[PDB]
């Protein structure tokens, strides 16, 4: 229920998808403006039942599962061996 | 603090990484056995500061950001237009 900055509101698409309106700039967004720490300019984190969590780049109209700032690939670590 | 099934315990690596021991099978795991709904056999979800959330495949010793059952690529949706 985190409070929006002045000049922001929340709305829903005709199919019921929540989104945010920035009346200061007349732009629309999928995520809360105060929930974007760690994300670069132009990107948002999206939650969904269809895809789970992913990331969108509005400038380039792209979506990807990898957080845009995460290492290019993650590391596999074998769980520790059983000791005797 | 979710209770473990019988024959399971929790331990830590020398560097302090939590893990789970299944004494029923003498196998080790990065995630709680009761926190794997929606994951296929052999896979685990991993949380980390280095990579954020990702997924590991123990059989093939692979790691990836995409949930193994998620669609191959996620969809970009443009936020709704401003109406006048």
UniProtKB/Swiss-Prot annotation, chains A, B:
Phosphorylated by STK3/MST2 and STK4/MST1. Phosphorylation is not required for SAV1 stability and may increase the number of protein binding sites on the scaffold molecule. It is found in: Nucleus; Cytoplasm. The chain holds residues 199 to 282 of 386 of the full protein. Regulator of STK3/MST2 and STK4/MST1 in the Hippo signaling pathway which plays a pivotal role in organ size control and tumor suppression by restricting proliferation and promoting apoptosis. The core of this pathway is composed of a kinase cascade wherein STK3/MST2 and STK4/MST1, in complex with its regulatory protein SAV1, phosphorylates and activates LATS1/2 in complex with its regulatory protein MOB1, which in turn phosphorylates and inactivates YAP1 oncoprotein and WWTR1/TAZ. Disruption phenotype: Mice show progressive hepatomegaly with a 2-fold increase in liver mass relative to total body mass at 1 month of age and a 3-fold increase by 3 months of age. Embryos display unchecked proliferation and defects in terminal differentiation of epithelial cells. It comes from Mus musculus. The modification Phosphothreonine is found at residue 13. Disulfide bonds: none annotated. Ubiquitously expressed in adult tissues with the highest level found in testis. Residues 2-35, 37-70 form the WW domain. Homodimer. Stabilized through interaction with STK3/MST2 or STK4/MST1. Interacts (via SARAH domain) with isoform 1 of NEK2. Interacts with ESR1 only in the presence of STK3/MST2. Interacts with WTIP and AJUBA. This is Protein salvador homolog 1.
